[PDB]
Symmetry: C2
Subunit: 289 residues, 2 copies
Amino acid sequence: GPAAVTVLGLGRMGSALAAAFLAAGHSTTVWNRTPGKADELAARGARRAGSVAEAVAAAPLVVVCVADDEAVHQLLDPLDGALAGRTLVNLTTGTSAQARANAAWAKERGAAFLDGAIMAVPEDIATGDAVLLYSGPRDAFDAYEEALRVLAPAGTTHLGGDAGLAALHDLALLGIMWGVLNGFLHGAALLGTAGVRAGDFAPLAARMTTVVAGYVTAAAPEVDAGSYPAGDATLTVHQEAMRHLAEESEALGVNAELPRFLQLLAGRAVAEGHAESGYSALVEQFRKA
Amino acid sequence: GPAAVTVLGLGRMGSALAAAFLAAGHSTTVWNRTPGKADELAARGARRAGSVAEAVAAAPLVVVCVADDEAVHQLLDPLDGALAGRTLVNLTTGTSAQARANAAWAKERGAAFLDGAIMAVPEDIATGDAVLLYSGPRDAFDAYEEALRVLAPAGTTHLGGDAGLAALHDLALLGIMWGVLNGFLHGAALLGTAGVRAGDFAPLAARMTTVVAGYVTAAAPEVDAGSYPAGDATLTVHQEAMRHLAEESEALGVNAELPRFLQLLAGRAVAEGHAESGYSALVEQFRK
């Protein structure tokens, strides 16, 4: 039946992971450095382990979700032989270098290793909206996919064998998130000068964000072909509208560094021959240090 | 019955507007500087106006959609009494300054004036994905709402009476577009170093964009309350992740100016006391 699992880390996210495993019928053993965080899970059927060593011994699948890579090694480095024969899944946030170093670290302890990235807030764990990304040996992912999938039943993806891939994808997706939020917050500042509450702008901003998701899909073949048709706006047209957004900002006393930076990316592409190309031509300067 | 309408300007957008009006059964009069653009519309029942003056006289509702405000005034400035008593709807992209000037210019000519912003590509006109935003006198929007709605049946919004409001919304929403596309293109450059095709990344990138749209909805009450709970990520955590994105860009030989700029903005909020606040606190530095 369902694999036994251990979750190390009972912060907001780790607690959500443990609850999802337990709700799906998995034997779920939990442990946390700060005390008093396991009482509700234990009441629902989780096992509160007496130590990190006991917790790791409880299951073949060991899921870690703590503050950072330093915290991971604070828990696991003292172990001696505990991880041999197990599969370690690190859903802690970190870098690609930390992920690759962890794969080698785990291999020396006789453990399989998958790095993961949680592309979700805790309340979206175990919903159709959650996305969790994994990288490392495919055999370990395939063996535990059915257990891992409870965390993101419609969004569990193995990216490939290089253990650093999940962290790279995590940072790239965060880049999109920050692009959205900066655009929303700068626009909320701009429209707020005209008496528009952020709650009245947000439905338009969320709708437009969903529309632009489709523009991302349209852009991908252009990037892959290296061919950048203007569509309905050359980069000259984009550049002029960006200048307009900077002018609106400056006239209202709103910070204009973001629209000027956007205008600079476009202006550079224009100076390098893309005045008549579509927006996807901006990938060319993103590729060059 | 349906209002008679005139469309001035038959580029890709303007042609799509006129096509939608005509398919909905409006008397549709069209004019373009290049007459051939009207051929297919006229064959389907649109009236090819012989001149701008004839076009404007044909209908009480005059929709303009040309390259920029300079082009708008090249068409309309020569008119003499033509626009009196009519309602002019300017769907050309422009600035709030241009919109304020146009409201005055139209009133001097006895015309009601709505500024509009088309938040759609031409092929999405008249679909449920189209968004079109208007500002100007509410009574003029009311008088022609049913006609205007054919351009965006599930997306037509009057924003308010302030002459420049549609232009401000247009450019703010374009800001979101550019930030998203930059994130996608930079992420595609980054992941391309590891063998990831943009077409492989795009399903994830698009899905995550749709998720973040929900984060926008959640952020708005924080902005309006001036209270920025950390949620699951303080600005300290965000700034560190952006530093990691920049460092990874540098180590892989892709451009790091975008993540460095993101870091800079977050660091400014941190230095103003928001180390432990959530991302919405960034609104305060956008206000100065």
